[PDB]
Amino acid sequence: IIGGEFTTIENQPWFAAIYRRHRGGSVTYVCGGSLISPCWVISATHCFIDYPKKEDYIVYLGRSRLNSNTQGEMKFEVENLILHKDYSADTLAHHNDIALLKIRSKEGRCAQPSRTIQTIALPSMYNDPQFGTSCEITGFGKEQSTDYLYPEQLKMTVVKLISHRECQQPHYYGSEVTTKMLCAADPQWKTDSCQGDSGGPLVCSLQGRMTLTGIVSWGRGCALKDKPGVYTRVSHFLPWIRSHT
């Protein structure tokens, strides 16, 4: 997250931290995700496409820090890793960039709701906030484009939804953005998601309910003028989600 503010898991208790094991045993951070039911985390396909073996991954819930344990956290293996069959990427855009992880602990259990672990509601179909609406993004991704390290403490910020018509202008992203994507950015371009935030939640208030409106997917650079963050539009994937869960 470029700009924004530090936070803790209590302010985004559906946030899932996804790591990968390496041959040799070191574990490194991959991507964010969102807990949509006790046994199911939703994320981005591009996070896993190069190493699609479910045994490679570890999922934490209730975690506020990247490389230290948070009190109350739960650790899970990935029972099933479901990537979107119509995924595709070009130099920039990632199409159908959505993935489901069925989580299960060593004891055979799913998430137990607590003060630090809660689910997030899905939107109703084709129901998104109007353009200019402020929404939240959360993650452990870079604080600057040029950073080598990821922040050790969870961050969040606010971005505003951009209309498809505006995001499709040539000076923004042209035809690389589809109707199954949502664009969001800061009016001054000073805050944004970045590398390592992929798979994490874009949350908006809809009908007086906190709702998973987007999944961090792609962008050209981070917090760069005329280059919004691009998010998988969750309200266009409800049949895919319901069928695979």
């Binding site: 990968r20 991959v30 991507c31 591009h46 996070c47 896993f48 190069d50 190493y51 990427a89 130099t91 920039l92 990632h94 991704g141 484009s145 040029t146 998601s193 970045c194 590398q195 390592g196 935030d197 992929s198 961090v216 997917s217 792609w218 962008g219 050209r220 650079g221 981070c222 963050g229 691009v230």
Partner: peptide, 14 residues
Amino acid sequence: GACSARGLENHAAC
């Protein structure tokens, strides 16, 4: 570059 962007996390080339 591309490898420092959203889209190429956990990629073999990067």
